[PDB]
Amino acid sequence: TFSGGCLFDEPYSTCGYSQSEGDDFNWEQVNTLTKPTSDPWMPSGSFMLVNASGRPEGQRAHLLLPQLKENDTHCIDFHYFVSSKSNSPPGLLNVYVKVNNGPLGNPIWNISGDPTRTWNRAELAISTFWPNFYQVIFEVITSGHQGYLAIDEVKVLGHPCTRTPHFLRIQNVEVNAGQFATFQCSAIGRTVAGDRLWLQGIDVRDAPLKEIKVTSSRRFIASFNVVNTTKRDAGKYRCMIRTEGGVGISNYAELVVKEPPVPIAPPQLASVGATYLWIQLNANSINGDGPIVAREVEYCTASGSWNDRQPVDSTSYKIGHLDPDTEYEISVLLTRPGEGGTGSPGPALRTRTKCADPMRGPRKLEVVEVKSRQITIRWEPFGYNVTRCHSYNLTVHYCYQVGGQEQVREEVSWDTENSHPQHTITNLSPYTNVSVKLILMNPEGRKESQELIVQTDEDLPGAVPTESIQGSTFEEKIFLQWREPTQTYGVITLYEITYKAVSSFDDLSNQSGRVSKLGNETHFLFFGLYPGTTYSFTIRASTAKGFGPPATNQFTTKISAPSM
Amino acid sequence: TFSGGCLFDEPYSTCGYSQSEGDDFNWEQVNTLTKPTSDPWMPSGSFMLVNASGRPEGQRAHLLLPQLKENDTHCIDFHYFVSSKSNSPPGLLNVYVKVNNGPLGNPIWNISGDPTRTWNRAELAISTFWPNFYQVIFEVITSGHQGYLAIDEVKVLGHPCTRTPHFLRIQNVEVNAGQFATFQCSAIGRTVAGDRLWLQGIDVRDAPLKEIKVTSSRRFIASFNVVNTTKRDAGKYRCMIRTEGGVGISNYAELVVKEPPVPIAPPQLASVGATYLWIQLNANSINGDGPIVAREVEYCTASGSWNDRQPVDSTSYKIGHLDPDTEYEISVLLTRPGEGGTGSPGPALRTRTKCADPMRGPRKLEVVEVKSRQITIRWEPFGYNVTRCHSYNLTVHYCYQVGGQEQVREEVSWDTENSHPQHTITNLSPYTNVSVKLILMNPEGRKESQELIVQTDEDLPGAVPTESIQGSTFEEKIFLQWREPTQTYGVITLYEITYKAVSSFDDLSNQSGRVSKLGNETHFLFFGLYPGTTYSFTIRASTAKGFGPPATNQFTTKISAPSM
Numbered sequence A, B: 001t002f003s004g005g006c007l008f009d010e011p012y013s014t015c016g017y018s019q020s021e022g023d024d025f026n027w028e029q030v031n032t033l034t035k036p037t038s039d040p041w042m043p044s045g046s047f048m049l050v051n052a053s054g055r056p057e058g059q060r061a062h063l064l065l066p067q068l069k070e071n072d073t074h075c076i077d078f079h080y081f082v083s084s085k086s087n088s089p090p091g092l093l094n095v096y097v098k099v100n101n102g103p104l105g106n107p108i109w110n111i112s113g114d115p116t117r118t119w120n121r122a123e124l125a126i127s128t129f130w131p132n133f134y135q136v137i138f139e140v141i142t143s144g145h146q147g148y149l150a151i152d153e154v155k156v157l158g159h160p161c162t163r164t165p166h167f168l169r170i171q172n173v174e175v176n177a178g179q180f181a182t183f184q185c186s187a188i189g190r191t192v193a194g195d196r197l198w199l200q201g202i203d204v205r206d207a208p209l210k211e212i213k214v215t216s217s218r219r220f221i222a223s224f225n226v227v228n229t230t231k232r233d234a235g236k237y238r239c240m241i242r243t244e245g246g247v248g249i250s251n252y253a254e255l256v257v258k259e260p261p262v263p264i265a266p267p268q269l270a271s272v273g274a275t276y277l278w279i280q281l282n283a284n285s286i287n288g289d290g291p292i293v294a295r296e297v298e299y300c301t302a303s304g305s306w307n308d309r310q311p312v313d314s315t316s317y318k319i320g321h322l323d324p325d326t327e328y329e330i331s332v333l334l335t336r337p338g339e340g341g342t343g344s345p346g347p348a349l350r351t352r353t354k355c356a357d358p359m360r361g362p363r364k365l366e367v368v369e370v371k372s373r374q375i376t377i378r379w380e381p382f383g384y385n386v387t388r389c390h391s392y393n394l395t396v397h398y399c400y401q402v403g404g405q406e407q408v409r410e411e412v413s414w415d416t417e418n419s420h421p422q423h424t425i426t427n428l429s430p431y432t433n434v435s436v437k438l439i440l441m442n443p444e445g446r447k448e449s450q451e452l453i454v455q456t457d458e459d460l461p462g463a464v465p466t467e468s469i470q471g472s473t474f475e476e477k478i479f480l481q482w483r484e485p486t487q488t489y490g491v492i493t494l495y496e497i498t499y500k501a502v503s504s505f506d507d508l509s510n511q512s513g514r515v516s517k518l519g520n521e522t523h524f525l526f527f528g529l530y531p532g533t534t535y536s537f538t539i540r541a542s543t544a545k546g547f548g549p550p551a552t553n554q555f556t557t558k559i560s561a562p563s564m
């Protein structure tokens, strides 16, 4: 029950055939073995003719089979004939296959077609089935030249073609723009060396055969790639094979070229930390299309040093484990399905992280040298890892008494860039306990070092006050007494004290000496002197580091009636 | 503002600490430099004690930090002390990290812990942040033996640990059952040769380190694989690293082990064709779980010869381009996302395709030899490709007349398995046009061969009827006449006819002969005979293949008065 053919003995109306009356001219129907003819370039029998004779170039005539709507594999075959006259093509012969009353589409078969005064078989293996349907259409386009073109036994047959393979139903293909798409055409039949293979589309560039894989004499697989795809490539396509005796075509199959996602606006900033960064992935309003199946966050330091791509599950996302006083650049990457699925990174939020209050105060706080009214200290350097902030300051903090009131000073060392840093404190009182500490400050907090204590070196004292130097005289002895120096600058270890006989009730007064005494007693009983004489005494106090300056005074011994 | 620590000078209540009063006994709080002690195995200072002395094995005591809920990277560190006595462990020391007031979980740190009469630092790098929270818990389990176990300066610090790395937040992992899952732990710190690494879970088997990749002194990536996964593997997991001076732990991250899809019931059969098969993919009611992201149909011939896996887009799906009288087996494959995503093929619909009516009638229908009443014919063999049905029959159909009525016979050749097949028709009439044709039949339709015509060979005729053999006599001559044989079986080419003088009015009658005559005239004028004599005549008709049988008769010449 598999008709649609036509031997053209009956009128072609009978076969379901018709003329596209919106073109230029009509095909003729002829029977030479009822009405014979002298014409040399006309063959015998019953056929449909196009007489291109007297016709200008470009003029075309269309002749349509009825619309077929089959289930089983079938094969259409027909015979054609061309003749001049001159010997030039009277016109081209095209065959189109319009499917589901859609566009005419590109032609699937054609001869150029030079004269041969001989008939020729040609079959078509169209793979378009119920519930879809298709219309075969024969078109002649006139060359301007003066010959004949004929069709003679169209035959629709409910079995596979014999000289052309058949394509198995090809399904739609989705692809991400930029990447290439591939059409895998399964076929059932033999293909040979001469056979031409390609992928045909309506209103889009046809693609060529990429490769062919011959599984057997009975079946093969031809692949076709549409390359560097855009939305302008998206459309309908079908596989093609032309063999010496026919042409096979697949169904149409749609290429959907979808554009990978990119987020419209950058990620909003939720809150800032020292070592973290809560952000808001916007990435809902997007610039491409398709189902987002994966969302990554990508961040890099402004210098470059570090960068990390990391998948994010929620809208609110925390970037933890960052560096404190650091400039960060964050973009969001979206991903749709398939090979080029991810696509570009969105606008970048640029933000920087707070400072952390410092790890700790500096360390190895040593004394280098101590002096009378000054000392030098030192410590181990530290850097970004202790400071946790590119802006900071280091401060030296000392404390002491002299002797009544306290004094509490602070300085600022500039040894930010220093191997074996130092700081020399000055303007101190001797023999005083300086309590030193290094306080490290940044805008968030502070950390003081270990507290060191350094006793300032001793020094030479002041002189014994001259008001204090009081003496008690006797014939033959003098008791000298004094008070400690108003300001000692150390422990008084010794008093050196000299005496000279200066005058007398007169001889030769060779009666001098020096004497010494522990610091803890401020007196000296002068032993065995001359009476009536006056002695000068000069005292000098002393400290571990030697003698201070001299007070001095004179006293004169008693006299008495001589005896006897 | 980063507290949670405890020096244990203040009561531990002050630090946020407490006792899990639903266990066996409580930790003690001690101050040896207010209340001194003779006990040799007790150190100086302010700490929390567990006195395992007098305690049986198994008995445990718990001591909880408060719950921390931080944002910035921090590091917990504490000091511990163990002493016997004997020299055996008075008990184990465990540390747990309970997160979001969930289960206690497995312990993250522990010493066995043999005596050393010395303190020991230990830090923890816990990566669980606001809005989540966690509780550190110190547990001692008594060994049965008689020693002391102590904790002395817990310190929460708002900076990274110094001797342990930190894990970056690990996200949840989905995996298909059967395949393995992988936990990629990003870390920030240094890891060394001695460090122990693993993946810890609550209520599931822990997995071991698969590999470690050291990007720098500052950061590395440790991978952990859960192998041959089932739903019994699905749960919460976190990364672990133990270093000589501490332990770092990631957040928990969920393993979701989903089961690949399999369809519950087979594909329903929609309609059957010769070269096709509309089916209904049920594959909606399914046996696994997850979003079906791809559906394939798979079919194979019952023999095996061909099988094809092909993606299907709709519920209703047509399998085209099949072989006719062929048993087919069809199962549906479903696919969910990820590495082991497809999973098994469903129940199989088993069905077979109809027959196609045959391609054509057989060919090269030749004559081999023709005979009088029989002939032999032959043709080219064909097979499944012409028959399109494993059940069929070939039939020989002939037609002829003899001579009045028609005869129309049909036979059935059994040369199903034959190189150069033959069939000898019999019981035919000679010199008759037999019109032969081979009709090939199967249950769907038929196709007759080309119609051949064979003229059956000639044969010897019948005799001339003896009623017809009439003669007219004269003195000296006889005119013999007859009719053609009632049934000639060919064209009569000759009549042979003999005559003998048999008697007379009496000598020596040597007066015989034979004569011949074209078939198209049935008479003979016998030339110059004797009068009064009687002649016997015997006629024999002839055909291309020779003489048929004889009719025969006698006539006698006239007499007359003699003259003169």
Ligand SMILES: *[C@@H]1O[C@H](CO)[C@@H](O)[C@H](O)[C@H]1NC(C)=O
Pocket: A039, A051, A052, A053, A054
């Ligand atoms: C084609 O048209 C020309 C008129 O220009 C006519 O002479 C010729 O016979 C036609 N050929 C046909 C219809 O056979």
Ligand SMILES: *[C@@H]1O[C@H](CO)[C@@H](O)[C@H](O)[C@H]1NC(C)=O
Pocket: A069, A070, A071, A130, B271
């Ligand atoms: C082809 O098969 C379809 C689906 O069963 C059926 O409806 C149709 O009538 C069949 N034959 C024709 C008319 O193409």
Ligand SMILES: *[C@@H]1O[C@H](CO)[C@@H](O)[C@H](O)[C@H]1NC(C)=O
Pocket: A107, A109, A110, A111, A112
């Ligand atoms: C067939 O037509 C195409 C254009 O549709 C042309 O490229 C090709 O040369 C033609 N082939 C022939 C006539 O063999």
Ligand SMILES: *[C@@H]1O[C@H](CO)[C@@H](O)[C@H](O)[C@H]1NC(C)=O
Pocket: A382, A383, A385, A386
């Ligand atoms: C980080 O801190 C340390 C001090 O412990 C310093 O030696 C180093 O230069 C800093 N940077 C690194 C990790 O190289």
Ligand SMILES: *[C@@H]1O[C@H](CO)[C@@H](O)[C@H](O)[C@H]1NC(C)=O
Pocket: A391, A392, A393, A441, A442, A443, A444
């Ligand atoms: C030192 O400089 C830091 C800036 O990094 C500032 O925070 C701090 O207050 C300064 N010290 C003082 C109190 O002068």
Ligand SMILES: *[C@@H]1O[C@H](CO)[C@@H](O)[C@H](O)[C@H]1NC(C)=O
Pocket: A431, A432, A433, A455
């Ligand atoms: C300095 O420190 C020492 C040691 O603490 C102490 O004995 C002494 O009294 C302090 N003052 C002076 C003036 O040395």
Ligand SMILES: *[C@@H]1O[C@H](CO)[C@@H](O)[C@H](O)[C@H]1NC(C)=O
Pocket: A518, A520, A521
């Ligand atoms: C003072 O101290 C010294 C000890 O260095 C002792 O010899 C002497 O007796 C003391 N004298 C006084 C005045 O206390």
Ligand SMILES: *[C@@H]1O[C@H](CO)[C@@H](O)[C@H](O)[C@H]1NC(C)=O
Pocket: B039, B051, B052, B053, B054
């Ligand atoms: C531990 O308990 C025992 C009692 O069996 C006691 O003698 C010992 O002093 C305790 N140790 C402590 C609390 O220091």
Ligand SMILES: *[C@@H]1O[C@H](CO)[C@@H](O)[C@H](O)[C@H]1NC(C)=O
Pocket: A271, B069, B070, B071, B130
């Ligand atoms: C940590 O950050 C969160 C989110 O901004 C904030 O609500 C919380 O108060 C912060 N600090 C604390 C109390 O952990």
Ligand SMILES: *[C@@H]1O[C@H](CO)[C@@H](O)[C@H](O)[C@H]1NC(C)=O
Pocket: B107, B109, B110, B111, B112
């Ligand atoms: C720590 O505890 C685990 C069990 O949780 C045990 O396998 C391991 O030996 C212990 N390690 C020590 C005490 O170093």
Ligand SMILES: *[C@@H]1O[C@H](CO)[C@@H](O)[C@H](O)[C@H]1NC(C)=O
Pocket: B382, B383, B385, B386
């Ligand atoms: C198919 O049919 C042909 C007849 O054209 C026959 O030669 C062959 O044995 C059959 N099977 C195949 C394709 O091998």
Ligand SMILES: *[C@@H]1O[C@H](CO)[C@@H](O)[C@H](O)[C@H]1NC(C)=O
Pocket: B391, B392, B393, B441, B442, B443, B444
């Ligand atoms: C021959 O056998 C086929 C079975 O394949 C059957 O369809 C056909 O009708 C038979 N021929 C007749 C009419 O006896």
Ligand SMILES: *[C@@H]1O[C@H](CO)[C@@H](O)[C@H](O)[C@H]1NC(C)=O
Pocket: B431, B432, B433, B455
């Ligand atoms: C047989 O066929 C031939 C050729 O068609 C014909 O001329 C003849 O009359 C037919 N009949 C006999 C009896 O030969």
Ligand SMILES: *[C@@H]1O[C@H](CO)[C@@H](O)[C@H](O)[C@H]1NC(C)=O
Pocket: B518, B520, B521
């Ligand atoms: C019969 O036919 C032959 C030709 O073969 C011719 O010689 C003869 O004259 C014919 N005679 C009759 C009786 O028609």
Ligand code: NA
Pocket: A007, A008, A009, A045, A046, A047, A152, A153
């Ligand atoms: Na015809």
Ligand code: NA
Pocket: A019, A020, A021, A022, A023, A024, A025, A026, A027, A061, A062
């Ligand atoms: Na037209």
